[PDB]
Structures are given as structure tokens and as C-alpha cells.
Amino acid sequence: MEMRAVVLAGFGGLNKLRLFRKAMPEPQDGELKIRVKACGLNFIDLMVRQGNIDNPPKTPLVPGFECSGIVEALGDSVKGYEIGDRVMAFVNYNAWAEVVCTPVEFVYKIPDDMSFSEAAAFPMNFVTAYVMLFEVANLREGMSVLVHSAGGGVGQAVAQLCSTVPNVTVFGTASTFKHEAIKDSVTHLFDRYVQEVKRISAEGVDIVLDCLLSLLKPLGTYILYGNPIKLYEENKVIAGFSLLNLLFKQGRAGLIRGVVEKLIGLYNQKKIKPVVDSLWALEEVKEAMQRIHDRGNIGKLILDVEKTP
Template identity: 40%
Template sequence: MRKVIYPKVGGVDSIRIVEADDPVPGPGQVTVRIHRAGINFADLMMRQGLYGSNPDYPFTPGYEAAGEVIEAGDGVEGLQSGDRVLAMTGFGGYSEQIALDASRVIPLPDSISFDQAAAIPVTYGTAYHMLVHLGNLANGETVLVHHAAGGVGTAVAQICEAYGASLVVGTASSPKREFVESMGVRFVDREVEDFVDVCKEMTEGKGVHHAIDPVGGSHVMRSYKALRRGGKLYYFGASAAVKGDKKSTLTALRMWATTPRFDPLKMMSSNKAVFGVHMGLLDDESV
């Protein structure tokens, strides 16, 4: 079989496709023939050496994939050859085949395509974990999300609609306005408007209940300021550390240097909460 590897830190030209032995399922595992693999911003950060929790180089990226079961190992029940599945791979999804624990595989109904399935776990899992599991999103609440046209932004908009949020404010670049607005989101052109002012104006000066920030650096404090008293900020990315195709150490250092330090006493006085979210490092996978 073939698989993608990141042999070292580098740009797109560092990516390699290599031949490898077909995997064999161990006890409690299945092998899956991958038809589609999800691509996430985290994969780019891993390639640039900015992610911090990927395996040592060389390794195969890919958090999520969809395909069909090739073979089930000893002790596996409920899965058999030919079953269509969604695989939460962790790493290794950029392969033609992968062996993984059967507990990380979910059968797919025929109504969900491989394209759709491979785009679900990371983005929708992250958005749901933040808004519902941590945030207890309620009917009538208000939400700010950055990179609103991205995978998590799209999932946030759909979850907010399902849970009855009264307002979703989404930042993005101007070419993405039409798509963002098509989801019922109040579009904010990040190059022209101040999202803090927009959030305040649209909530009678109070601010939003939830703010979702994948940018990092000084941007995080601005998201915090967009919250009302009792609001919740979820910080789950660091796009401000990336500039271009290859790693920029200066850009990354600037982001880390401008990341705010929160004063617990001030947080207590405003009843605000800050959550750091990294789905790849959750110890309790049932969450």
C-alpha cells in the first residue's frame, strides 16, 4: 500500500508518498481500506513543526478517514469485511489502509457518503465539545466564532441553529461573506469591522455568551472582551502562528509572546470562564 509521510519539518515540497506493508489487525482491531481522509489545519501545523503533540518524524498524518473494513481481528464483534465505516485514526489517516482499534470505528449508514463522513469527527467533535459539553449552549444564547467559513465555523453555525442560538457572529475574509451569511451567521469582515464592537452593538452592549477563538495571540483577549459577564471563551487553535507555506519562527514567537495571561481575580469579578481545548489530548475519549 501507499501512505503519506512527513519526513521532517518543512513546506509542501517536503511531503512524501511511500510504499509500506499492508497492515494486519491485532486482537480487537480492524483494518480499513481508506476511501477518503479528512484534512485539517492541525495537519499543516504538524508539517511546520508547530503542533507540539504529533509523533516524532517521520510519521503519517491524518486524524480522520472513511472507508470499508478489510478484515476484523480476534475478538471484534459487530464489524466485518465490507462494512462502510468512519475511522477516528488519531494519526495515520493519509494511507490507503490502516489498522486501528475497533472502538475507534463507527459503522456508516448508506445515507452518508465517504466525503461527508471524513469531514465529521474533528470539526463537529470540536464544536460540539466546546459549545455543548463545556458550554451547555442554551436556546436564545449568542455566539462569536472566528474563521467562520472553516470546518469548525461551519459546524458551530449548524449546532447553534439546532440548539436555538439567537445570534451567531462570524468573522472571515470578504470573499467568504456569501457562504457565511448563507448559514444564517452575521458576517464580520475581519479587515474592516471590529468584531468586539459588533458583538456589543448586537447584544445591547452586553456581549456574547460564547466566543470561539482558533487564532491565538493578542486576538484571544479581544475575544474575551467580546463576552458578556458570565460568558465563556474557548481557545482551540493558533492560526496566528502560521504565515505562509513554511515555518516562520518569528511569527510563531510573536503569537506566543502576545498570548494573554488571565488574572483569576478579574475573571472571578466578571464571572467569565476560559477553556483551552485540544481534542487530540483528551484523556477521556468518551468525552
């Protein structure tokens, strides 16, 4: 009949969040219904909360884009799933709730070894990382990568994936308060460096990843994620990346599934592993967001739907 959900009453600060009961959605054709066990907290959720969003959706709204759980009901015309299957999923909002309906093309079966909390930490960070390194840039042996915010979710995803390719040097920057916790992830770590990087690699780096130029080698790539004659003259590449838009506006679910299958292969070979920081109740969402604002987390924050506060 009804479910519990986190509701953003309107745009503003933390105190616009509510926990309310609402109608359980039912799966339309080509959707399935997920009994949610965990939800990913992403930086973009803080932006949605303030209304710093392109074409902001109407409030009130249930936030969240990433979740894991158990298939509880099938929509018409769904291939490949049975109720009781364990899955992770993307969803265009509405993830922060006990039940979620989403089109099947955004749903991925998870291995038995993968817990729900890990699974809800898996898709946003690792797909973003994988797509930037191997689909936007073409990371190969011997290259070097500069990763800003090396301690963040995507930063850590990038560092693990780089280690699957031989002889890749990863340069990270981060809050100097974070260095002891993240130092073992990267080859060289800096305290927020151009000179310091140049001292190890005179020409700079092959790939720079920068979240919401002069550091690039020739043929290098700068990628921004969530003067054209200069590019010609300097032989450089600039790119932008928004996983949500790729999914929900541009129709590339099929491609992303390819990426998720490769990510799951790597996970099964024990070459990558999402790092969950802490598990938070639905009542504790304000506190979790605050912790992300205060940059106090080492790993991913995860909402545990069945946790009591």
C-alpha cells in the same frame, strides 16, 4: 502485502511530502483494518507538516487523523463489526494511506445515505463543535455565540449546530473575500467588530470560540481550540479544547462515541450536513495544503484515495 501512503520525510515545507509504498499494517487485538476511501485534511495537518506539534512524533511518518472506508479485516476481540461495514474513524496519525489500522473505540458505522467523502469530513469538525457548545459551554435557547473564522470547518459545524437550538444568534468573523459564500450560514457576519457586535447586543456574547474576553456577557465562556481574579470579578469562564488529546491521551473515547451518536441522529433528521469542497488525489496533497494556506476553499478538503490525478 504493501500499500501506498503519503509520507512526511521530515519537518519543513510542502516539498517534504512523498508518495511511497509501505508494509500494510495488520490489526492487533481490539483494532480493525480499514480500506480507506477518503481522508480529512485538517489545519493541524499543516502544523504537523512544519513540526509545530506538542511532543512531535518521529519522522518519517504518515500524517492524518480522520478517514472513512470499509472494514477489510478484524483484530482479535472486536465486537460489533463485519468485513464490508462502512465506517469513519479517528486515527493517531497514519490516516493518509490506502489502509489504516485503529482501535475499535475510535470507529463509527456510517449511515447508508452518507457518502465516504462526507463521512471523512464529519468527525473532527462536528465533534469539536459539539463538544465545545454542549460539553464545555452549555448552549441554551436565546444565547449568542461569537465564532471566529466562521468560514472554516469548525466554524461552519458550529453555525449548523447553533441552528438546532432555538433563538441562538451567531456572530461570525471572516476574510471579507469569503462573505458572499458564508453569509447565509450566520445571523450577522463581520470583516475581521467589537463595536458592531455591541450595537446588536450591548452586553456582548455568551460564548466565544477562538481557534489557534472583553466580548463576554456575565457567566460567559471563552474557549480556545485547535489573571484568575479577573475571572472572579467579572464572572467569566475560560476553557481550552484539544479533541486529539481527549481521544488519544486522556481516554475519553466513550464520551466521544456518545457525541458521534447524537451527531448521526441529527444528520439522519437532515439537521446537519458536512460540506465537502473538493476531492484530491494522493499525488495532489501539496496542492491541497497550498489551497488551505491560501484560504481558497469554501468547504472541507478531502483526500480521495482511489482518485487518479
